């Protein structure tokens, strides 16, 4: 029914190795080589990759900036509102970023802000200036 388990033999594969006297040792060399021709290319990329690991040397440790650990808040200070308005100019609709930047405002308060002050801060205008970049 089927070739004794393991043993490999398929219709096309067989016509391939019998086409002439040395198709035998031809298809076996084209593969012996495709092997070295990939083993080499590994050892190459291995060295390329081992250079890059030298560049990432020591990680990014000495450039981290301590955590902005700080609680939320309900009132908008004139301070906060100005920071907000600028974040919008620079971050568009990324309410997440805007939040982090202002510091003590939740990703929601932010979107709320967007509607209440939309009127007085021409937030339409601010957004379309960000869009124009």
């Amino acid at each position: 029914r089927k070739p004794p388990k393991g043993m490999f033999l398929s219709q096309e594969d067989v016509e391939a190795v019998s086409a002439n006297a040395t198709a035998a040792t031809t298809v076996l060399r084209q593969l012996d080589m495709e092997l070295v021709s990939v083993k080499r290319q590994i050892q190459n990329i291995k060295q390329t990759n081992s250079a890059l690991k030298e560049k990432l040397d020591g990680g990014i440790e000495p450039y981290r900036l301590p955590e902005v650990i700080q609680k939320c808040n309900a009132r908008w200070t004139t301070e906060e509102q100005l920071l907000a308005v600028q974040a919008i100019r620079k971050y568009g609709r990324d309410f997440q970023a805007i939040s982090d930047v202002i510091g003590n405002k939740s990703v929601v308060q932010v979107k709320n802000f967007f509607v209440n002050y939309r009127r007085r801060f021409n937030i339409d205008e601010v957004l379309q200036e960000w869009e124009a970049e």
């Binding site: 033999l9 076996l28 890059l52 690991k53 920071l83 930047v101």
Partner: protein, 666 residues
């Protein structure tokens, strides 16, 4: 199986079915009612049993009826027909029995039998008992032909056949009861020893073997499923098939390694992408921290755009650190996932140098068994005789196989030292012209009704002809003779004054160094009472080694034997013999095989008798005159003693039918 059905089996017959040959003797029965068929069948089996249970004395129609029971011993016309059929075709009363009904008063018809092989001998005894006048012509100064047994002092070794292949349904079983044979079983434990003389270890041994068996199965698959039987006109040999299978097993081992390492680059090529995105992150991160520091200079209280800058760069920065952290996350995983792949690769090779050398010994054993290079066997057909394998374990003839021919020979008219040279067969009869092998100009002429030819196929093959047919055999016969294969296989008999091998071990193999020499002295047999070792030359070696002198051979031998058992365990041998069957003019080989481009059907062609044309034109078509028996004429049991012996039983039947008529078929 056993009982009355035990017999039918032990007689190579189906117990619950009528054979092709019964259908012809008994067409009335088999075309008739399912009911009588069973009566026939029972009578047959019971009669066989009767014979089998006591094959040391003749079994008569008298004694048979005697021991049957009603309802079956009612129709005595039938029981007679049956006992007669079995007697004629040699299923009962064959070999060496004690005869009850004495030998016919005057004899009828005259048969000249060529060759006193086991087949000839077997035929001769049959016809003689059937009341015919028989004479055998034998070129050699002894009987048994390809059953030769070296005898000297106490040394006894066969350079001919030496194995009996299992008593389950073998006629030799019957014979071994009739004749003094010491049958001894062959313990199939066979240690191999590498070229250097170091025993190959169980780990390898068993794993190589089963690859061999797996390789054979493989070839069978190519033949029956993938229909790989002809390669641009040339028909495929088993060797061709085996190579194509091994090639494909390499081609796979490679295909593996490729898409393994090919699966590594693809990963490295990810690690590379990562590290680039990861470097250009450090770049920006480094370059931002700078700016943040600059904008942090501007000492508070700042206006808000300057505050915004500080706050904003501090996000932008930590934001990109979150990114670079996760890329260091990935980096770590990709990097264990390469210790994964680098740790377990697939297999390095299909077979090591040392493996494909042991596998060769296995291929050697297979060549030994077919007497030929695997590159000559027919793929489709080489093992057609398979389903007829006897049960029971193989044996050897401790006191030498000749004991059998010598016993069949007893009471027969045999002319030794008589080489047949021409067979003339014409409408009114045959004449056979032999010469004396000793002084060859001295001539002999034997005239007879029929000629039974047991010339080995090697002999029938010779160019120019060693025997001449007049008129020549028809092209349908001679083509069967080209087409069939006649192999070769030699023996070396080593006679020592002491055992120095493992006494309890029957055989052990030497592993040659090359494919080309895998046949050479590859296997030794411990078989006999005296200290004799027996070594085989098989396959491509067998033929080549015939052109090398005995001394050189016995040398290469002792060497191999010292290499195993230690350089001074092994004395000079007291007596040595070296067979050369291809060179032996009355054999010209060892036994047949199914050559590529043949088929078992050629064996049937080999056996069909020849019928000479008319003398006077428009005289009626005669009787057939020339008959054939022998190892090469028995489709289902070729190349064997039992198989010859049967072919001879067969012809005696067919000859009697022709010349004494067939009473039982009415």
């Amino acid at each position: 199986p056993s009982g009355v059905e035990g017999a039918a089996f032990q007689s190579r017959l189906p117990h619950d079915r009528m054979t092709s040959q019964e259908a012809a003797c008994f067409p009335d029965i088999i075309s008739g009612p399912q009911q009588t068929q069973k009566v026939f069948l029972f009578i047959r089996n019971r009669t066989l049993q009767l014979w089998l249970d006591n094959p040391k004395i003749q079994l008569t129609f008298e004694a048979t009826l005697q021991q049957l029971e009603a309802p079956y011993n009612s129709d005595t016309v039938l029981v007679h027909r049956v006992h007669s059929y079995l007697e004629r075709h040699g299923l009962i009363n064959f070999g060496i029995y004690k005869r009850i009904k004495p030998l016919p008063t005057k004899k009828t018809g005259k048969v000249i039998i060529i060759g006193s092989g086991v087949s000839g001998l077997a035929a001769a005894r049959q016809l003689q008992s059937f009341g015919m006048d028989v004479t055998l012509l034998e070129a050699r100064d002894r009987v048994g032909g390809r059953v030769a047994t070296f005898r000297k002092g106490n040394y006894v070794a066969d350079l001919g056949a030496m194995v009996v292949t299992g008593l389950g349904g073998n006629p030799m079983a019957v014979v071994s009861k009739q004749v003094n044979m010491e049958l001894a079983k062959i313990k199939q434990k066979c240690p191999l020893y590498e070229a250097n003389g170091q025993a190959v270890p169980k780990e390898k041994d068993e794993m190589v073997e089963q690859e061999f068996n797996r390789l054979l199965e493989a070839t069978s698959y190519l033949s029956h499923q993938l229909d790989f039987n002809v390669l641009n006109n040339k028909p495929v040999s088993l060797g061709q098939a085996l190579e194509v299978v091994i090639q494909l097993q390499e081609k796979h081992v490679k295909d593996e390694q490729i898409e393994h390492w090919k699966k590594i680059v693809k990963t490295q090529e990810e690690l590379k992408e990562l590290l680039n995105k990861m470097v250009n992150l450090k770049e920006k991160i480094k370059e931002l921290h700078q700016q943040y520091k600059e904008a942090s200079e501007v000492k508070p209280p700042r206006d808000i755009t300057a505050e915004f800058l500080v706050k904003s760069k501090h996000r932008d920065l930590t934001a990109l650190c979150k990114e670079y952290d996760e890329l260091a996350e990935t980096q770590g995983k990709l990097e264990e996932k390469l210790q994964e792949l680098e740790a377990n690769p697939p297999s390095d090779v299909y077979l090591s140098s040392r493996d494909r050398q042991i596998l060769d010994w296995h291929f050697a054993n297979l060549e030994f068994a077919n007497a030929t290079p695997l590159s000559t066997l027919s793929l489709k057909h080489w093992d057609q005789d398979d389903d007829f394998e006897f049960t029971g374990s193989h044996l050897t003839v401790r006191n030498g196989y000749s004991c059998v021919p010598v016993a069949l020979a007893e009471g027969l008219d045999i002319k030794l030292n008589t080489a047949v040279r021409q067979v003339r067969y014409t409408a009114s009869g045959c004449e056979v012209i032999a010469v004396n092998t000793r002084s060859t100009s001295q001539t002999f002429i034997y005239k007879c009704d029929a000629v039974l030819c047991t010339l080995p196929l090697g002999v029938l093959k010779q160019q120019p002809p060693a025997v001449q047919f007049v008129p020549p055999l028809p092209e349908w016969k001679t083509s069967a003779v080209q087409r069939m294969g006649f192999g070769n296989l030699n023996k070396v008999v080593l006679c020592f004054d002491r055992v120095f091998w493992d006494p309890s071990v029957n055989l052990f193999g030497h592993v040659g160094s090359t494919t080309a020499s895998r046949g050479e002295l590859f296997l030794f047999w411990n078989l006999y009472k005296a200290p004799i070792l027996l070594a085989l030359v098989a396959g491509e070696a067998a033929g080549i080694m015939e052109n090398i002198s005995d001394d050189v051979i016995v040398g290469r031998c002792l060497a191999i034997l010292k290499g195993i058992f230690g350089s001074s365990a092994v004395p000079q041998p007291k007596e040595t013999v070296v067979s050369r069957w291809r060179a032996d003019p009355w054999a010209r080989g060892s036994y047949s095989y199914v050559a590529a481009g043949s088929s078992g059907n050629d064996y049937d062609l080999m056996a069909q008798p020849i019928t000479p044309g008319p003398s006077i034109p428009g005289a009626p078509q005669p009787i057939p005159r020339l008959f054939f028996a022998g190892e090469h004429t028995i489709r289902n049991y070729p190349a064997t003693v039992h198989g010859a012996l049967l072919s001879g039983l067969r012809e005696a039947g067919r000859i009697a039918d022709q010349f004494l008529g067939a009473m039982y078929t009415l």
